[PDB]
Amino acid sequence: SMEVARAARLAQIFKEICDGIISYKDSSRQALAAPLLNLPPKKKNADYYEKISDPLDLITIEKQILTGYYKTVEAFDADMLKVFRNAEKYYGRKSPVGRDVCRLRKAYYNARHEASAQIDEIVGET
Template identity: 30%
Template sequence: MDIDRRRQEAAEYRRKPRLIEDSEIPESIVKASQHFINEEKESQKEKFAFESIGRRKRKEVDYSQDLMSDRDWLRSIDEDVEDDDDDEAESRKKRRGRKERGKKRRYIGDDDDEPPKRKRASPEITSVLNKLHEALITFKTSSGKQLAGAFEQLPSRRELPDYYEIIEKPMDLNKVKRKIRDGKYRSVQDMGNDIRLLCANARKYNIDG
């Protein structure tokens, strides 16, 4: 039915078939974007710290197991991220002490007008973001279909020129990966914003395309 409808729409409106249907947008990715926001709200008061990562064995999660539901998948991510927050309280005190001592060493004559440089993401944040990105990429349905496949790499401008006319800020999971690698995401929420943009772009193209 979907194939017939696509062909009919393409013939009637003289355009290429849709890149992806609304019904094909993985619910897990949509939910994950909200999950990222919730995680950031919980961790805003404290910075991520992983001083004891090497002292404990992480829970291994098989995101590709056939019978795992979207809810189970998100719960697995949530549990893994919460494990990484266990050491925050202890390290927060140490970091706060160092920060206060650093402030005392500043001189009044310092140039306060110079805009602060944007810092790269910490290795700890990068580790969390890589884990979440990998979870999105590898998650599969019970039939073995990789849900993120349509979002991993956008078609080129030559292959789908009308997409780039409709979508102002194209986004795919490969671009998200590059931004993680380059340290451009300083929080889970930053990455979540791009995941939401990715899903919004797919919906917009389906409606306007």
């Protein structure tokens, strides 16, 4: 098949997974991915951008998916996991935001495990 077609099929999968993370709610109906959605405004969180070198938020990922910016799942994985790592690096694995990010990763690995079959069928038309 044609690469842009492939990259669109993938994009659709990446958007579903990423929407699952953004929308993800605990039994308590509160959105765990909320802290991950927007990068703190530079002007009053100058200390953030000193601790994080390669900052990324879910809104940006969500935006780039729609473009076909992610041509492989590794590039996607890399971006999604960087947003989680940056969160733990800044708030601490033990903070309430790390307890959350931790749990969101599990969600991420399940949705990624489940998509894996479709992702292989696409990539393996090369």
